[PDB]
Design an enzyme around this catalytic site. Structure first.
Site, mmCIF file in Angstrom:
data_model
loop_
_atom_site.group_PDB
_atom_site.id
_atom_site.type_symbol
_atom_site.label_atom_id
_atom_site.label_comp_id
_atom_site.label_asym_id
_atom_site.label_seq_id
_atom_site.Cartn_x
_atom_site.Cartn_y
_atom_site.Cartn_z
ATOM 1 N N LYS A 188 0.810 -1.214 0.000
ATOM 2 C CA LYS A 188 0.000 0.000 0.000
ATOM 3 C C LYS A 188 0.848 1.273 0.000
ATOM 4 N N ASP A 214 4.488 -4.210 11.950
ATOM 5 C CA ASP A 214 3.777 -4.732 10.783
ATOM 6 C C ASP A 214 4.143 -6.195 10.533
ATOM 7 O OD1 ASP A 214 1.936 -4.648 8.773
ATOM 8 O OD2 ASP A 214 3.201 -3.556 7.328
#
Ligand SMILES: CC(C)Cc1ccc(S(=O)(=O)NCCN2CCC(COC(=O)c3c[nH]c4ccccc34)CC2)cc1
Length: 331
Positions: free
Chosen positions: A48, A155
């Protein structure tokens, strides 16, 4: 009254004791090389906030991986660079080779050492129970390193683990959401990916720390050994907690909320309901029972906890009996 403050129980003051220029990335000076040193060969993937290509270096004719950065605050580009520069050479961390800007577009890009991804479709039907123990140990190596260096990854999820199965090498990647731990700091809770968001993120509890990474890691283990991907399958962020509460029960969740004096969104105040904490055996079945063991169920349970203080540290995790066999083979 507001929330109860929290502190990391390991590696707490690691950043306090360093020179300022270690963690003060906003003032870091980066010298930008020229991207036409590189020639893009083929796309490898796309996040992203990045776009990964395999490239060659038309100077020393070497393979290499170029990650074009998507338009983000300069700050966060310096942060990822600073963190990558701070972690270079650490066990199982990705290796930064250059930092470049395309001359005409002037878009920043990071250049990394080459790695090969093993056919992600191969991993499904080849991963033995031992193989999971091995590549999970490798991942804890990288997380223990970077937590000891005062950095949380934030993450941790399979699309961020490079594996080269033929050579049994693993690399932790995408450090774009990584951040320095500073005792007492309140961090943004819009991080990680849904299926891996720790409870502290879903309830907006801002003094989280390294143990955030241990929750996500527990979700991977969960999804691996049960062959259920993702293991907490949420329709939105509020639902994600409900998927978790249906597994972990609500009594512990409401203990967690009272212990930290978290105030809860009025949205939650009716969707969670009441739920028992389910027994891990509910999730075993004929096609995943070869990866499930009493050791794995102990280990997994000691990661998936609401209270982040009580999750294992990377260091404690690597000491779990789940890893006895692989520690033996490393000699
Ligand atoms: C504990 C166990 C073991 C769980 C587990 C299961 C499967 C896998 S998995 O490997 O199948 N995961 C799918 C992701 N893969 C790797 C990323 C690909 C895109 O992006 C890049 O390739 C790079 C981004 N930055 C880079 C820097 C250098 C080189 C390449 C890149 C897409 C394909 C991993 C762990």
């Amino acid at each position: 009254s507001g929330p109860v403050p929290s502190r990391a129980r390991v590696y707490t003051d690691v950043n306090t004791h360093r020179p300022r220029e270690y963690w003060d990335y906003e003032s870091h000076v980066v010298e930008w090389g020229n991207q036409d040193d590189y020639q893009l060969v083929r796309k490898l993937g796309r996040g992203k906030y990045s776009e990964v290509f395999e490239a060659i270096n038309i100077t020393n004719n070497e393979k290499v991986v170029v990650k074009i950065l998507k338009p983000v605050k300069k700050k966060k580009i310096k942060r990822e660079i600073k963190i990558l520069e701070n972690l270079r050479g650490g066990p199982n961390i990705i290796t930064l080779a250059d930092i470049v800007k395309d001359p005409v577009s002037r878009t920043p890009a990071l250049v990394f050492e080459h790695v090969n991804n093993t056919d992600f479709k191969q991993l499904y039907q080849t991963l033995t129970d031992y193989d999971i123990r091995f590549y999970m140990y490798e991942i804890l190596k990288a997380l223990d390193y970077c937590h000891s260096m005062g950095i949380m990854h934030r993450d941790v999820k399979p699309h961020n683990v490079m594996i080269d199965h033929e050579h049994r090498k693993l690399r932790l990647i995408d450090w774009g959401l990584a951040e320095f731990y500073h005792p007492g700091q309140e961090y943004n809770v819009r991080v990680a990916s849904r299926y891996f968001k720790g409870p502290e993120l879903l309830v907006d509890y801002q003094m989280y720390d390294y143990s955030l990474d241990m929750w996500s890691l527990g979700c991977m283990l969960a999804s691996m050994i049960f062959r259920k991907e993702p293991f907490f399958h949420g329709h939105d962020n509020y639902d994600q907690l409900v998927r978790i509460a249906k597994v972990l029960g609500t009594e512990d969740l409401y203990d967690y909320i009272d212990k930290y004096n978290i105030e809860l969104d009025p949205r939650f105040n009716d969707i969670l309901g009441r739920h028992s904490r389910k027994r891990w055996e509910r999730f075993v079945h004929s096609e995943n029972q070869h990866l499930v063991s009493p050791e794995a169920l102990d280990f997994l349970d000691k990661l998936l906890r609401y209270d982040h203080q009580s999750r294992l540290t990377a260091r404690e995790a690597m000491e779990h009996p789940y890893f006895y066999t692989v520690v033996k083979d490393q000699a």
